[PDB]
Amino acid sequence: QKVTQAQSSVSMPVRKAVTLNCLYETSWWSYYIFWYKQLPSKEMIFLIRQGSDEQNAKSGRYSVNFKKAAKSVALTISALQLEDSAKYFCALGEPSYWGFPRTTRVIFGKGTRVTVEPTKSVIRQTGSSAEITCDLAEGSTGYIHWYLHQEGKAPQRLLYYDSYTSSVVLESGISPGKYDTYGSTRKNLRMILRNLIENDSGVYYCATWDEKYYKKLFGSGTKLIITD
Amino acid sequence: IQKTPQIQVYSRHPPENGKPNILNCYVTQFHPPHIEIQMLKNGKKIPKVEMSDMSFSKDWSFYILAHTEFTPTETDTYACRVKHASMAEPKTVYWDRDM
Amino acid sequence: RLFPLRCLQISSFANSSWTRTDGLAWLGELQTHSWSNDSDTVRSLKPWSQGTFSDQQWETLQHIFRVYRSSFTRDVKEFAKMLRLSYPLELQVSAGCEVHPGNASNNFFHVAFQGKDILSFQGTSWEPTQEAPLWVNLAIQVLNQDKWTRETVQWLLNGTCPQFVSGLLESGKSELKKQEKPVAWLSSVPSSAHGHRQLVCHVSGFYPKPVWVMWMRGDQEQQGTHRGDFLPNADETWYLQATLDVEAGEEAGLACRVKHSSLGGQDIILYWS
Ligand SMILES: CCCCCCCC/C=C/CCCCCCCCCCCCCC(=O)N[C@@H](CO[C@@H]1O[C@H](CO)[C@H](O)[C@H](OS(=O)(=O)O)[C@H]1O)[C@H](O)/C=C/CCCCCCCCCCCCC
Ligand SMILES: *[C@@H]1O[C@H](CO)[C@@H](O)[C@H](O)[C@H]1NC(C)=O
Ligand SMILES: *[C@@H]1O[C@H](CO)[C@@H](O)[C@H](O)[C@H]1NC(C)=O
Ligand SMILES: *[C@@H]1O[C@H](CO)[C@@H](O)[C@H](O)[C@H]1NC(C)=O
């Protein structure tokens, strides 16, 4: 597994500290590690970034303990609050021989639910279709990425839209005809799902790389419930 | 900012007449690295002249080695002609057996 | 007995249309690699040129250099356009490392513009030379914010190159320690001062480079011996000459003695005529 979060669930009292473990596998000598936070609203929020050549990253209550030898990067939240209850995801950006293009996918671990102890919802029927709309102000209109999160699994990128070639690039293993996009780089862009089955149920994110700082920004997730 | 090339002609083996040998032409201390080098027998161009990949020293000045097969005689003269941007007219250096 | 690895790059831009980029790799005095603008890969000049690296390892390096040459040419051309720099442009790169007995190593990355030093890669970052055009700092702050370039250069210099050189020294040990016997002959040229003659002692075809050449009368060394520069033979051996200024008629009795590691402990002694 490329990114391994062994802890499925963790419960910790308020005002105390929790540490979430993440193990990664990469043969590259240069890479990024990201930590994300999924609220109950299914909003995906960026927390902290750990460079491969950098020292241990510290932002606010979030701190990263980076052991490059063991390929172990662990998030630690200092003083837990009630709003800190969420599912936390460890993620790894890999490069290519061309460096870090904005076409770069982000690889997720299956996540860890943290319980601190004291958006649009769409429903469709099997065989129909649906349109997921993307609301993103910033940063990069260059490539718009679409991610799918299903419970029990790690978030996967389905595809991305190349505005330079004006075409859709599907990830390996995905049959064409299932997904397509319609629109411009402007917020009018939407993803169409065709021939819905029950396994298409989940949360759908639109994502882009930020211009100023290098991180993957996820839009508000769309919850798609599909009934037979 | 243009450096004038220095030419040195010498033989690989002891220069005894009638015996086959190799004539080296060593050009150094020039810049930019664009240079024309011809080896001449009796004033005429030698068709086959092998050359090394152009390199440079620690001072960044370029150098290159040109060499060819030749058989020295009493009458025959051998020279190395170099055309470079740092010089108005191409400089020719003649092989001297006693040098 | 030092074998540093020098990787050289010659990049010429004549005009917006015409550009060449070529490269060399020296291990000690021997050229182990050749890189041509016409070629899609780096050519190995020796059986041991790849060292102990696998094919996968060498392909990884091959990929990097191929991408590097493309980007470098693109970056320089656009950077020149932004600054209104006047063509032609001549860029040179000298990089590599050296392995030391204690498993330690030192490396270097140097860039020159129009024959003059501009910037170099020290540690984790690029730094300018004290006398450099002010615009060099623009290129450096860009190069420093490039994570891929910064980390790959480190990976090459610190991570790869020392392991690579170690492999070359082990695999090419037989040829690197080779001994090539010199061959000497004598000549005379008319001196600048009338009534004198200059004797020339030629020494050619020897390797490794260290050599001892002195004009001698009997067991007494002539102090007037003048050593010249080392001139390369194309067969990977060295050529050297030594001169002595003597009065005409004093030639007889003089000899040229040559000491070299290939001579089996016995000096070459060449008498006049
Ligand atoms: C261990 C070595 C063993 C070698 C054995 C074989 C030796 C034979 C080879 C001989 C050749 C000798 C010369 C070469 C010496 C070593 C060169 C190492 C090069 C390392 C290259 C690093 C990676 C690389 O390709 N860098 C290149 C590609 O970078 C990527 O480019 C992309 C666009 O194409 C993107 O911009 C990307 O950024 S991102 O935001 O999308 O992530 C970015 O990371 C990049 O061009 C690197 C440039 C560094 C050049 C060196 C510094 C030059 C400074 C002087 C120029 C400025 C002055 C100009 C004046 C007009
Ligand atoms: C660029 O230089 C080449 C030779 O270096 C020359 O033949 C060509 O004319 C030049 N290009 C232009 C547009 O002048
Ligand atoms: C050098 O190679 C590049 C890319 O292969 C090519 O575009 C360019 O024309 C070549 N230059 C010469 C002088 O062959
Ligand atoms: C690599 O470089 C680092 C610092 O840049 C140094 O601590 C380490 O000793 C180097 N490794 C080798 C094998 O030279």
CATH of residue B48's domain is 2.60.40.10
Q: Could you tell me if A104 and A125 lie in one domain?
A: no
Q: How far is the CA of A54 from the centre of ligand 4 (A)?
A: 15
* Paired tokens of C54: 């696998």
Q: Please state, in angstroms and rounded to a whole number, the distance separating the CA atoms of residues C3 and B73.
A: 41
Q: Is C152's CB within 8 Å of A29's CB?
A: yes
- The DSSP call for residue C157 is I
- The DSSP call for residue B3 is B
* Paired tokens of C18: 């015409």
Query: Alpha-carbon Rg of chain B, whole angstroms?
Result: 14
* Whether the Cβ atoms of residue A215 and residue A197 lie closer than 8 Å to each other: no
Q: C136-144 and C147-154 are packed helices; what angle lies between their axes, rounded to 10 degrees? A: 80
Q: Could you tell me if A92 and A181 lie in one domain?
A: no
* Whether the Cβ atoms of residue A59 and residue A74 lie closer than 8 Å to each other: no
Task: Name the 3-class secondary structure at B44.
Answer: strand
Find the domain containing B99 and state its range. 1-99
Question: Which residue, of A99, A118, A137, is where some domain finishes?
Answer: A118
Q: Please state, in angstroms and rounded to a whole number, the distance separating the CA atoms of residues C184 and B83.
A: 33
C1-177 and C178-273 in the same fold: no
Q: Which of C148, C153, C154 to mutate to test the interface with A (most CBs of A within 10 A)?
A: C148
Q: Where are the alpha helices (DSSP H) in chain A?
A: none
CATH architecture of C1-177: 2-Layer Sandwich (3.30)
Other Cβ atoms less than 10 A from the Cβ of A97: the count is 13
Structural domain total, chain A: 2
If we measure between CA atoms, which residue out of C83, C89, C95 comes closest to residue C21?
A: C89
Distances (CA, A) of C230 to A88, B10, B72: 67, 12, 23
Output the furthest CA–CA distance in chain B (Å, rounded).
Answer: 45
Other Cβ atoms less than 10 A from the Cβ of C180: the count is 17
Q: Please state, in angstroms and rounded to a whole number, the distance separating the CA atoms of residues C205 and A113.
A: 75
The bridge status of strand A179-182 relative to strand A106-108 is: unpaired
Q: Where are the domains of chain C?
A: 1-177, 178-273
Q: Quick one: C88 exposed, middle or buried, by C-beta within 10 A (0-12, 13-18, 19+)? A: middle
Q: Could you tell me if A90 and A123 lie in one domain?
A: no
- Please check whether the domain covering C178-273 is classified as CATH 2.60.40.10: yes
Find the domain containing A139 and state its range. 119-228
If we measure between CA atoms, which residue out of B8, B38, B23 comes closest to residue B72?
A: B23
* Whether the Cβ atoms of residue C273 and residue C232 lie closer than 8 Å to each other: no
CATH of residue A202's domain is 2.60.40.10
Nearest CA in chain C to B61: C115
Experimental method, per PDB record: X-ray
Q: Is B13's CB within 8 Å of C204's CB?
A: yes
Nearest CA in chain C to B68: C234
- Omega cis (within 30) before A139: yes
Q: Could you tell me if A150 and A86 lie in one domain?
A: no
Question: Which residue, of A101, A118, A135, is where some domain finishes?
Answer: A118
Q: Which residues in C19-104 belong to E strands, given as ranges?
A: 19-27, 30-35, 42-44, 89-99
- The DSSP call for residue A185 is S
* Whether the Cβ atoms of residue B35 and residue B28 lie closer than 8 Å to each other: no
Q: Could you tell me if A152 and A207 lie in one domain?
A: yes
Looking from the CA of residue C123, the nearest atom of ligand 4 is 5
